[PDB]
C-alpha cells in the first residue's frame, strides 16, 4: 500500500552551526576518561535515517482490533474539552520554541505581540476555511549524544524531526491541547504511562505483578514507530479525538489538522528546498505522544485478544508498552507472544526485538528502564527504577562552547536517586563541581517532558525525599544485575570504579558537612551511605511542603 515516505534527493541541511568537541573538557575530565566514545548525531547521518524509517505498510485490521476501538470511542465520549483562546495557546509556547518563517518567536508568542496574535488569527481562518491544502513542514536531523556501541553499528544515525511553522503549532494548542489532557487518562486509566513519577511506575509494576495468580510480563519493542502508523491510524485518532463533546468549531478544526497536517504533508529541509513527502506521524505536533500512547494501547490491546493473553495489565507510553498477564505455562506464553507480535504485525506495528515472555520483573526493560531491588541495613526489600547508566554518562560528559552537561546531571539525579550509580557516581561529581566553582546556592533547570523547572541543588535532599521516599538515602545492599552493569559501564567509559568513587564521596561529605547549613544536610542526608558509622535520618519538614505532583504528569 503506502510508503511512510517518499524522497526527492535533496539534503536533509543542518540550522547553522553543528559544534565541534573541544580538547579538554574541564567539567566532565574528572568524571569519564574515555571522550573519544561520547558523540552527537547530526544531519550528517541524516539520509541513513531516512532509509531506515522508509518502508512500505499494509495493514490489516480484525475483530478484536474493532471491538476494542469501539470500547475506547465509549470511553472518549465521556470527555468534554474546550478550544482554548488563541492568547491561552500563545502562553502555553516554550520559551524556546522554533521562531515562525513570519518573523516572530517565542518570545513574541508568550508576550501577545500584536503581529503573532495577527499571523496565528489569520492562519487559524484558513484552517476553519480550507480543510484539505497540506501544510507544509521543516524536516531536521535530531542532535543526541550517546556512547559508541561496537555491537550495535558503532554510531546511531540522528532521529528525525518534522514539525509545521509556529503559527500552526499554536493553533494545534487551542484545537486540540485540553483533549491532550483528558483523552489519555480518560481512554486508558492507570494504563497511561505519563502520569507517574519512578516511584509510582514501580509501586504500580508491583501492583500488577502481585495480582496475577501466576504473573508472566514483557515488553514490546515496536521497530520506528512513527513511520509505522498510518493515514488510516490517524484518520481513526481524529474519529477519537471527535468522540468527545467538543465546540463545532475545535471539530472543524481537528478535521482540518487531521486532513492538512497529521496524515501527511510535504517536507522542506532547512535551506528552502522539498525534501520528501510524509505519510506517517509526523515527530514535531502536538498530538504525536497522545497519538503514539493511544494507537499503540488500541493496538496492543488487540494483539492481546488475539493472542489470547489472560488478564493484561498494561502501561503504555508512546510507543513503550508493558504486559503483565496471567501466565499460561512457559510454552502457551511463548505461543501466545508469537501471535501477539503476529496481530501486532498485521496491525502495521512490528517489532525490532522480538518480545520474550519473563517471570522476573527485573528482567523487564521499557522506557529504557527496569525495576530492581535493595536491601535495607535490616534486610527489608525496597524496589526502585532504575536503567543502563551508559547513555545518562555519555550526557554528562556533553561540553562544548554551546552546552553544559550540569542540567543534564540534575536531571538524573532527580529521576534516579535512589540508583547505586546516581548515588556513588553522580552525585558525587556533582557535588564536587558546584562546592569548588563555589555555585551550590544557584539554581538549575530540572528537564522534564519539555518543561523546566528551577531546582536549588542544596533542596535535593527534600526533594528526593518527597520523590522517592527516606529509603532512597539508605539502599544498602544492591543487585548482581545492578552492580554487573554499572561496574561495566563505568569501564566502558573509562571512569573510576565504584570502590574510589566511595573516597571521593567521603571527601565530598566532609566539605559539605563543613560548610554547615543546607550544605551540611546534602552532606548527612546524600552520603551517608559513604560511611561506615550511620547516621539516623529522619523525615525531613521541609519535605511535607512539597509539591512535586505536576513533574512526571504531562
Ligand atoms: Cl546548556
Redesign the pocket.
Given at each position: 500500500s503506502s510508503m511512510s515516505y517518499s524522497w526527492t534527493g535533496a539534503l536533509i541541511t543542518p540550522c547553522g552551526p553543528e559544534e565541534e568537541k573541544l580538547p579538554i573538557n574541564p567539567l566532565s575530565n574528572s568524571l569519564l576518561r574515555y571522550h573519544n566514545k561520547v558523540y552527537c548525531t547530526t544531519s550528517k547521518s541524516a539520509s541513513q535515517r531516512a532509509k531506515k524509517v522508509t518502508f512500505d505498510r499494509t495493514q490489516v485490521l480484525d475483530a478484536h482490533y474493532d471491538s476494542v476501538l469501539k470500547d475506547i470511542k465509549l470511553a472518549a465520549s465521556k470527555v468534554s474539552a474546550r478550544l482554548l483562546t488563541l492568547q491561552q495557546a500563545c502562553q502555553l509556547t516554550p520559551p524556546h520554541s522554533a521562531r515562525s518563517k513570519y518573523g516572530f518567536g517565542a518570545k513574541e508568542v508568550r508576550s501577545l505581540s500584536g503581529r503573532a496574535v495577527n499571523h496565528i488569527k489569520s492562519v487559524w481562518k484558513d484552517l476553519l476555511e480550507d480543510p484539505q491544502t497540506p501544510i507544509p513542514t521543516t524536516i531536521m536531523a535530531k542532535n543526541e549524544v550517546f556512547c559508541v556501541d561496537p555491537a550495535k553499528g558503532g554510531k546511531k544515525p540522528a532521529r528525525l524531526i518534522v514539525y509545521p511553522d509556529l503559527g500552526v503549532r499554536v493553533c494545534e494548542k487551542m484545537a486540540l491541547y485540553d483533549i491532550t489532557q483528558k483523552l489519555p487518562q480518560a481512554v486508558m486509566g492507570a494504563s497511561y504511562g505519563f502520569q507517574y513519577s519512578p516511584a509510582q511506575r514501580v509501586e504500580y509494576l508491583l501492583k500488577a505483578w502481585a495480582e496475577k495468580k501466576d504473573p508472566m510480563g514483557f515488553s514490546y519493542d515496536t521497530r520506528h514507530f512513527d513511520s509505522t502508523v498510518t493515514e488510516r491510524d490517524i484518520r481513526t485518532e481524529e474519529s477519537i479525538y471527535q468522540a468527545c463533546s467538543l465546540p463545532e468549531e475545535a471539530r472543524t478544526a481537528i478535521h482540518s489538522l487531521t486532513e492538512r497536517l497529521y496524515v501527511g504533508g510535504p517536507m522542506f529541509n532547512s535551506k528552502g528546498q522539498t525534501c520528501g513527502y510524509r505519510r506517517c506521524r509526523a515527530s514535531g505536533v502536538l498530538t504525536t505522544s497522545m497519538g503514539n500512547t493511544i494507537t499503540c494501547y488500541v493496538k496492543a490491546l488487540a494483539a492481546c485478544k488475539a493472542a489470547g493473553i489472560v488478564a493484561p495489565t498494561m502501561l503504555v507510553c508512546g510507543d513503550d508498552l508493558i504486559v503483565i498477564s496471567e501466565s499460561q505455562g512457559t510454552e502457551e506464553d511463548e505461543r501466545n507472544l508469537r501471535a501477539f507480535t503476529e496481530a501486532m504485525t498485521r496491525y502495521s506495528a512490528p517489532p525490532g526485538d522480538p518480545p520474550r515472555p519473563e517471570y522476573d520483573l527485573e528482567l523487564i526493560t521499557s522506557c529504557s528502564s527496569n525495576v530492581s531491588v535493595a536491601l535495607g541495613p535490616r534486610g527489608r526489600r525496597r524496589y526502585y527504577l532504575t536503567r543502563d547508566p551508559t547513555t545518562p554518562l555519555a550526557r554528562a560528559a556533553w561540553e562544548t562552547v554551546?552546552?553544559?552537561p550540569i542540567?543534564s546531571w540534575l536531571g538524573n539525579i532527580i529521576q534516579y536517586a535512589p540508583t547505586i550509580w546516581v548515588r556513588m557516581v553522580l552525585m558525587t561529581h556533582f557535588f564536587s563541581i558546584l562546592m569548588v566553582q563555589d555555585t551550590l546556592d544557584q539554581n538549575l533547570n530540572f528537564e522534564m517532558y519539555g518543561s523546566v523547572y528551577s531546582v536549588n541543588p542544596l533542596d535535593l535532599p527534600a526533594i528526593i525525599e518527597r520523590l522517592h521516599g527516606l529509603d532512597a538515602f539508605s539502599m544498602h545492599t544492591y543487585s548482581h544485575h545492578e552492580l554487573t552493569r554499572v561496574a561495566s559501564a563505568l569501564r566502558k567509559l573509562g571512569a573510576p570504579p565504584l570502590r574510589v568513587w566511595k573516597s571521593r564521596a567521603r571527601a565530598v561529605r566532609a566539605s559539605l558537612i563543613s560548610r554547615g547549613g543546607k550544605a551540611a544536610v546534602c552532606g548527612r542526608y546524600l552520603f551517608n551511605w559513604a560511611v561506615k558509622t550511620k547516621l539516623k535520618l529522619t523525615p525531613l519538614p521541609e519535605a511535607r511542603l512539597l509539591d512535586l505532583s505536576s513533574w512526571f504528569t504531562v
Open positions: 554551546r552546552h553544559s542540567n
